[PDB]
Structures are given as C-alpha cells and as structure tokens.
Amino acid sequence: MDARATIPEHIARTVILPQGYADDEVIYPAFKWLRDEQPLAMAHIEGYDPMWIATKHADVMQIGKQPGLFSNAEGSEILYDQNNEAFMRSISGGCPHVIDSLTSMDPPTHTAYRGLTLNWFQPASIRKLEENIRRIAQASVQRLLDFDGECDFMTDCALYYPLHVVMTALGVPEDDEPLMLKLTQDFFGVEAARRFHETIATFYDYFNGFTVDRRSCPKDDVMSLLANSKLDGNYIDDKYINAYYVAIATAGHDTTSSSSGGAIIGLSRNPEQLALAKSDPALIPRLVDEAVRWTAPVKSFMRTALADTEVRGQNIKRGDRIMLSYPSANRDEEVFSNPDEFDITRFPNRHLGFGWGAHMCLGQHLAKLEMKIFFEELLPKLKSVELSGPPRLVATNFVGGPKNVPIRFTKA
Numbered sequence: 001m002d003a004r005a006t007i008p009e010h011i012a013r014t015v016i017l018p019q020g021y022a023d024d025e026v027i028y029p030a031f032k033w034l035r036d037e038q039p040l041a042m043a044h045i046e047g048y049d050p051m052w053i054a055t056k057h058a059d060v061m062q063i064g065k066q067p068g069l070f071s072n073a074e075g076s077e078i079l080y081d082q083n084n085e086a087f088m089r090s091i092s093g094g095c096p097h098v099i100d101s102l103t104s105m106d107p108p109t110h111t112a113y114r115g116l117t118l119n120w121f122q123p124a125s126i127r128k129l130e131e132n133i134r135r136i137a138q139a140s141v142q143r144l145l146d147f148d149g150e151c152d153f154m155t156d157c158a159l160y161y162p163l164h165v166v167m168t169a170l171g172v173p174e175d176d177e178p179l180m181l182k183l184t185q186d187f188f189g190v191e192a193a194r195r196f197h198e199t200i201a202t203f204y205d206y207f208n209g210f211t212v213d214r215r216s217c218p219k220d221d222v223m224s225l226l227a228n229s230k231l232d233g234n235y236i237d238d239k240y241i242n243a244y245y246v247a248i249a250t251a252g253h254d255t256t257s258s259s260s261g262g263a264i265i266g267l268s269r270n271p272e273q274l275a276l277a278k279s280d281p282a283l284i285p286r287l288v289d290e291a292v293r294w295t296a297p298v299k300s301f302m303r304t305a306l307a308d309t310e311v312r313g314q315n316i317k318r319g320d321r322i323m324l325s326y327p328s329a330n331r332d333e334e335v336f337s338n339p340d341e342f343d344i345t346r347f348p349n350r351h352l353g354f355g356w357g358a359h360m361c362l363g364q365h366l367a368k369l370e371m372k373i374f375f376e377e378l379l380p381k382l383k384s385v386e387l388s389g390p391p392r393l394v395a396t397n398f399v400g401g402p403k404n405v406p407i408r409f410t411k412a
C-alpha cells in the first residue's frame, strides 16, 4: 500500500483519524512513539493518501519556511480522506479548497493577499483596539460571575468572547451574532452540494452589503480596509474579499475559545499556578503562550512537495503529501522539558501553536492580546476554579481542543 510506508498501521490510524484527538492519552503517546522511533516517516492507511508525518519541532519549522518546496495550494491544505476531498472538489469546481483564503494560496499570490491586512494585524495596530477588547472581556467576565459558582466555562463564556472580538475587528454589528455563530458553529462546524452552494451564496450576499457600504462610508476595520483595497488599480474580486471575511472569522473563533478553555483546565488542575498568576500579572502573557502550547488547538495542516527533497535523511518525492503535527512539535523533548505539564512559568516558550513560516497565523498578535486582556479581567475576580467533571474535547484532526469545561468557582 505505497511501499515506502513504514509507520505501523496502529500508530498511523491513531494519528490520522479524528476519533483519537478527543482524548489526550490516546494521541500524545502515539506521537511520542513516532518522535522517538520514526520521527519522519510515511503512513498509508485505508481511505487516505500516503503521507509523511512531520512530528519533530525542527522539521515543522523547516517545511513551513519553504513554500517554494512544500505547497499549500497544490493539494488540500486540510486533512481529508480521498472520499471527502472528492466531495469537496465537486462543491469547489475541480480544486481542493472550498474557498479562496490565504491557506489555499502559494506565493506570489499569497504574499499579495496576505499583504493587504498584514500590518493591521501587527502589534502596534492591534493596540488601538484595547479599550474595546477590555469592554468585551468585562462583559464576558460578568456573565460568568453571574452564575452562582458553577457553569460550563466554554458554552457560558469563552464561546462568545473570541467571536465578539473578531466581529469588532471586521466591523460586523453586535446584533448579528446569530448569523456569525451560524457561520462558524453550524456551516463551518465539525444533495449536500446543492445546499452548500446556496448557503455560501447567502453569506456572500450578506458580507457584500458591508463591502459596498465601506466603499462609501469607511471606518477603521478590516472590512473597510479590504473593501477599499485595490491590487493593480482594481478592487479585489468579490470571491477573494468574501473568502477573506470568512477565513478571519472562522480562523479566529474556535482556536481562541479552545485555548482559553485549555488555560482553565491547566489552572484548575494546577491551583498553584492560579495563585502565581494572581500575584504577578506580568505572568498572564506567559500563561497565554503556555495555554496555546499545551492546548495546540490546530492539530494539523497539510503540504504537498513540489520537488524531490530531503528532510531528516528522508527522500520526499515530488507529489508527496506531508502532515504537519503542531501538537507533536509542541511536546518535542528536544525543545521542552516535561512537555505534558501545564506550567505557566515556562520560558522560553518557543511553541509552534501558531505555526511557523510563510502562513504563520495572521491573527497571533490579536489572539495573544484578547486572551491576555480576558485573563487580566478574570483572574482577580476568582478566589478559585476547579473542574466539576471531565472536559469534552472535539474528535477532529483539524481544529479541536476543549468544547465543554464544566467548572466550579468561588468569587473573590
């Protein structure tokens, strides 16, 4: 079954299939076997293409730095079994990408489209939003504190906070939360082509009304920036502007909620850390990097090789699919000691949670700023937080992490 495939089928099924990601003691041991035994090897299971699994921190940095060699755009950047990639190419008119977002793009296209928002996402630009993001965090902290010491931290709090922040960055009204939750939770959640096609049409007509509006009535927000952008003396095609609004909102919602949940499971299991964080606010930034390392919400992205190459003495033929495991890179013993412990003091924390390379998460500065402001508002409000039952994690090999964290808390 592709004779170059060496990973034992049991490990291979555990790392690829979506089931095992709902449980950390299923998936982290398998990846640990891989890093210790077959750090970069080929797996081929039934229903999927052969693929190399880059499990080492150093190999994920190296593949991600070379877009000329390992392509986003040639195959599906998302891990789908053949069956599914097929249904998708139907929906998508031949090509393995459901919308034309930055992740489906190789440079120079990618550099141009990414270029349009890149500086709006840089730290200095993101500071303008601070009074707003603190207003949103206080409303969300209040909501949780209105419970008498019990709630699901996700579905009662962290589900809405990251969506409110990305709605404000885009310029979408507070009142359209229903439709944005429908976009990220229902339509892009975890005949069908007939209903796909007219549902994306309805969202595109909706966003289209904002593009037109920002073109006569400009505001400082991402919709206005991209509406009014022009590449070669012409406005960006509506397909790319609307895929960009969708890419930011979906890319920015679940990853930030999941990492905030991850932080609460880590502090609930390690009360010495809550106490440490409460006594030195300077440590919140440290807690945010550790929550995103430890949680690793994006479990993988894919790459297709554009030439025969060699990484860690392996000979990657042209056309080979490669899986990038951000969870395995964040627990590589060559970079981190006791990588399974949640430890907020961990420094330096050079995790690959936001990726590395050309496609490195555009929203990383916005994601660290809104998680830091949320926790600065929340931690002083709590005397304690503990889990009241097991977190429920999403079974998915793409964006998973906690979906339910039932907690008990005492107000300060």
Ligand code: HEM
Residues within 6 Å of the ligand: 064, 102, 103, 104, 114, 166, 247, 248, 249, 251, 252, 253, 255, 256, 259, 292, 296, 297, 298, 301, 326, 353, 354, 355, 356, 357, 358, 359, 360, 361, 362, 363, 364, 366, 367
């Ligand atoms: C803690 C939260 C977040 C995590 C863990 C996360 C993770 C990632 C990862 C792993 C990638 C792939 C990077 C690569 O291939 O090198 C990515 C892509 C991306 N993320 Fe995030 N992300 C987070 C928050 C955000 C936010 C808040 C936004 C939106 C403002 C966002 C927007 C994007 C976009 C647009 C891309 C595509 C960039 C490109 O292809 O050029 N992300 N993110």
